[PDB]
Amino acid sequence: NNLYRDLAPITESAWAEIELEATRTFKRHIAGRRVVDVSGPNGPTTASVSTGHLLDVSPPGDGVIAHLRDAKPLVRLRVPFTVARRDIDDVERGSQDSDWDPVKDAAKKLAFVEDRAIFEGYAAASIEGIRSSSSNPALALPDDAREIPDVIAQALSELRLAGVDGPYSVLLSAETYTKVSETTAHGYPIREHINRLVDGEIIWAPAIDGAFVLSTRGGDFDLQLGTDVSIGYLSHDAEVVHLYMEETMTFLCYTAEASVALTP
Amino acid sequence: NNLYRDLAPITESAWAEIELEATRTFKRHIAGRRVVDVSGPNGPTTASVSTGHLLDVSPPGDGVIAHLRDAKPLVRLRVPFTVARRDIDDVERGSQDSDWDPVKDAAKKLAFVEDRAIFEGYAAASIEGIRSSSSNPALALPDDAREIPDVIAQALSELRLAGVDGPYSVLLSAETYTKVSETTAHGYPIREHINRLVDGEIIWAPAIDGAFVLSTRGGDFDLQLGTDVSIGYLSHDAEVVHLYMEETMTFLCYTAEASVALTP
Amino acid sequence: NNLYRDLAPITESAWAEIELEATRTFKRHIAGRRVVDVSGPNGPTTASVSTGHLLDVSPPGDGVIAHLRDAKPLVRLRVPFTVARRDIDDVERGSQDSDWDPVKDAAKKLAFVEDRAIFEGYAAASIEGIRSSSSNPALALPDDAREIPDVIAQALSELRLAGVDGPYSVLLSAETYTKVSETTAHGYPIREHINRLVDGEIIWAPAIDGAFVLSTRGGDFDLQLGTDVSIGYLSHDAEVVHLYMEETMTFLCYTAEASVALTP
């Protein structure tokens, strides 16, 4: 009800088209949710996640010991966008090529923001990313792609020597993903070697910079959602309708030695 | 299990006696829980209470609007105390007059701390009390007790003129309670007049300073408990056992004009 | 009962977390138990393993022949470690990132000790390892990884010429494992060649020095356990709890020509 979608001059079919486009774009442009554990929507009443720690505070009086409970607040991210009214009206007339580019742009922006917060951190929201939280030393991606299989093999060894078990996955930036896809060593593609090195999967991650090697055993990275991605309405005009894409979330990292970062 | 009561050299009967004494003392010395609404124990995993508000924060990037969710953290209060081992051992021998004075002192201290936090506030825990949160102007208790019925009648009128309804209750400090109990006007006790003025009850509140006139309709004052009063064990010796009384709580005031403070 | 875990100030959830971490780390860091035959726990009353041989001794008197029965005693290995009490207490408050690094370190130390005893021997315990017990001549690992497939093929031939049958497995040190994983010959990875040479499996063995080629038909290597890995409690303080990881075991090698050692 807080979305006020009933006040928007948008028909049911137009809403369905917009939602389909947004879902497709967000699914295509998101990679963090494919590795970390998602704590599903807890409702609009959720404002923070309890960590279970205690913080020393001044006692209310003599002879009393006081401790505050520690919690991490959620953050709400809102990406506004605008949709032309003629495109909405053409849907009911059988139009199959309505312009939903703003929806795609908003979905891409929200997905990139979420991925960067998960992996690179968001200081204002008190989110420490996987890269900063990792304790394993960071490796460097080689200049030539033919050496990528070696470095990924060095990281895995680290994860094995730290006691971290379970399937291992590699998240590669767009440039690194393309380089690995097209590179061959004496005619032998290097993807067929990385696929054998890694028993998990290679993930298309267009939002990160370098590469990440993580252990997907479970219980190391938790994305807490208070509210999942939702589309709402602000106002409209004789020509345009103003909507927004919204999400309330936070990220927590528990295991520091379950990730290795390969810098560019 | 976190109380570690199984490691203490205390028998079941001694535990029962200690708990009975603590419960009696805390019930006798507490007055805040008789007026405000208690949100019962939510378990050890509760660290904060969501308020439903939003705080502006710096956006993660251009074209995005960010808001943090606001929450009030809980605070844990711990009052340690010590019990002699001979008194514990005498319980199994049929002793009916074991020394539980430390338990009573700890219970009184915890109850007074909780009452003062509810009514006078606790800045370090971000708790704003009923007195500071109230918007109605504060009245002054008269020098002579015979005029107390008039001032209480002035406060009620205020509560009526602000639109606040429901039963009205008066919390009186120990000195004011005794003065009202013993005072008479031309032989007519003033308690029989205050009882007719007030359709709720007169509450013995030995922790507050002056007096409070509140509306007990409901939904104005909320004491959130993460964990109720519990007794735990720290360590022991050949002569003494070290225990503590613990409670995790916070207080929230919603209706500012549902209370009037009568200063001493 | 001899572990005295009931005296420890540790809750059930903390015990579960500690045991889970220890099991994960030990499973990740152990390789001997994946090849040899494990004679399961026989109970605390087991003190030695009978070999079935006889030792000449001085007769008690004229006209009598005396022989002592030969047995190999078990050895108990204990690795103490310490855990902070605040981390234990945070588990009941919903903490998901408690510090169990000491448990991981103890598990790694115990696993490495057991692996080195199985493969390199432990003279004080009268344990002769696989390397010293082997009768086949030891080969040398080549300087360049591209020649590793050849040497492993030389060892297998030896095992075939000695009459040893059954699946063959290769245990590689961490360095050799990584080298084999990353090395390629004219773009063709050498793992795809070693996997075809060997009909068993390639085992990650971070405790051994060079490499081992063994026959896993069965009945050649026996790890006798009197008591499996178990966690016990020694004492505690106001800040820390002292625990230990314990195991009673011995190792026996029967077939001398069922193993080949490739030195670094």
Are A154 and C187 in contact (CB < 8 Å)? Answer: no
CB atoms within 10 A of CB A238: 6
Pick from C28, C188, C191: which is nearest to A163 by CB?
Answer: C28
| CA–CA dist B117, C220 (Å, integer) | 73
Task: Report chain C residues whose CB lies below 8 A from the CB of B6.
Answer: 6
| CA–CA dist B68, A250 (Å, integer) | 10
| CA–CA dist A77, A67 (Å, integer) | 31
Pick from A54, A68, A71: which is nearest to B71 by CB?
Answer: A71
Token pair of A121, please? 């951190």
Are B2 and C89 in contact (CB < 8 Å)? Answer: yes
Are C92 and B1 in contact (CB < 8 Å)? Answer: yes
Amino acid at A22: A
| CA–CA dist B218, B241 (Å, integer) | 42
Nearest 5 degrees, angle CA A148-CA A138-CA A142? 25
Closest CA relative to residue A214, chosen from A29, A30, A26, A37: A37
Are A45 and B50 in contact (CB < 8 Å)? Answer: yes
Token pair of B136, please? 């109605």
For residue C60, the distance in angstroms to the closest alpha carbon of chain A comes to 57
| CA–CA dist B254, B26 (Å, integer) | 26
| CA–CA dist B131, C57 (Å, integer) | 95
Contact assessment for residue C250 and residue C41, using Cβ atoms and an 8 Å cutoff: no
Half-sphere exposure (Cβ direction) of A242: Cα atoms closer than 13 Å: 7
| CA–CA dist C142, C122 (Å, integer) | 28
CB atoms within 10 A of CB B227: 19
Please report the beta strands in B114-220, taking only residues with DSSP state E, as ranges in sequence order: 139-140, 168-172, 184-185, 188-189, 202-204, 211-215
Are A74 and B68 in contact (CB < 8 Å)? Answer: yes
SS3 B71: strand
For residue A246, the distance in angstroms to the closest alpha carbon of chain C comes to 28
Pick from B1, B47, B234: which is nearest to C11 by CB?
Answer: B1
Concatenated DSSP letters of B147-167: GHHHHHHHHHHHHHHTT--S-
Concatenated DSSP letters of chain C: -TT-GGGSS--HHHHHHHHHHHHHHHHHH--GGGTSEEE----TT--EEEEEEEEE---SSTT---EEEEEEE-EEEEEEEEEEHHHHHHHHTT-S----HHHHHHHHHHHHHHHHHHHH-BGGGTB--HHHH--SPPEE--SSGGGHHHHHHHHHHHHHHTT--S-EEEEE-HHHHHHHHH-EETTEESHHHHHHH-SS-EEE-TT-SSEEEEE-SSSSEEEEEEEEEEEEEEEE-SSEEEEEEEEEEEEEE--TTSEEEEE-
The answer for C248, left when phi > 0, alpha when psi is -120 to 50, beta otherwise, is beta
Please name the residue of chain C whose CA is at the shortest distance from the CA of residue A157.
Answer: C178
Closest CA relative to residue B38, chosen from B260, B262, B187, B252: B252
Please name the residue of chain B whose CA is at the shortest distance from the CA of residue C94.
Answer: B45
Closest CA relative to residue A172, chosen from A131, A141, A214, A202: A202
Query: Residue with structure tokens 């199994």?
Result: B92
| CA–CA dist A254, A36 (Å, integer) | 11
SS3 A9: coil
For residue C146, the distance in angstroms to the closest alpha carbon of chain A comes to 14
For residue B27, the distance in angstroms to the closest alpha carbon of chain A comes to 19
Task: Report chain A residues whose CB lies below 8 A from the CB of C178.
Answer: 153-154, 157
Contact assessment for residue C245 and residue C110, using Cβ atoms and an 8 Å cutoff: yes
| CA–CA dist A214, A254 (Å, integer) | 13
**Phi, psi (rounded to 5 degrees) for C227:** -150, 130
CB atoms within 10 A of CB B16: 11
Are C93 and A52 in contact (CB < 8 Å)? Answer: yes
Please name the residue of chain C whose CA is at the shortest distance from the CA of residue B248.
Answer: C93
**Alpha carbon separation from C247 to A55, A259, B182, C77, C111 (Å, rounded):** 39, 31, 76, 5, 10
**Alpha carbon separation from A206 to A104, A119, A176 (Å, rounded):** 15, 12, 10
SS3 B241: strand
| CA–CA dist A117, A25 (Å, integer) | 19
Contact assessment for residue B229 and residue B108, using Cβ atoms and an 8 Å cutoff: no
| CA–CA dist A115, A118 (Å, integer) | 5
Closest CA relative to residue C259, chosen from C30, C28, C36: C36
Are C189 and A186 in contact (CB < 8 Å)? Answer: no
Decide the pairing of beta strands B240-253 and B75-84: antiparallel
Resolution in A: 2.8
The answer for B166, left when phi > 0, alpha when psi is -120 to 50, beta otherwise, is left
Task: Report chain C residues whose CB lies below 8 A from the CB of B73.
Answer: none
Strand order in the sheet with A48-56: A48-56, A65-73, B75-84, B240-253, B221-236, B37-39
Q: Report the structure determination method.
A: cryo-EM
Closest CA relative to residue C159, chosen from C261, C11, C258, C36: C258
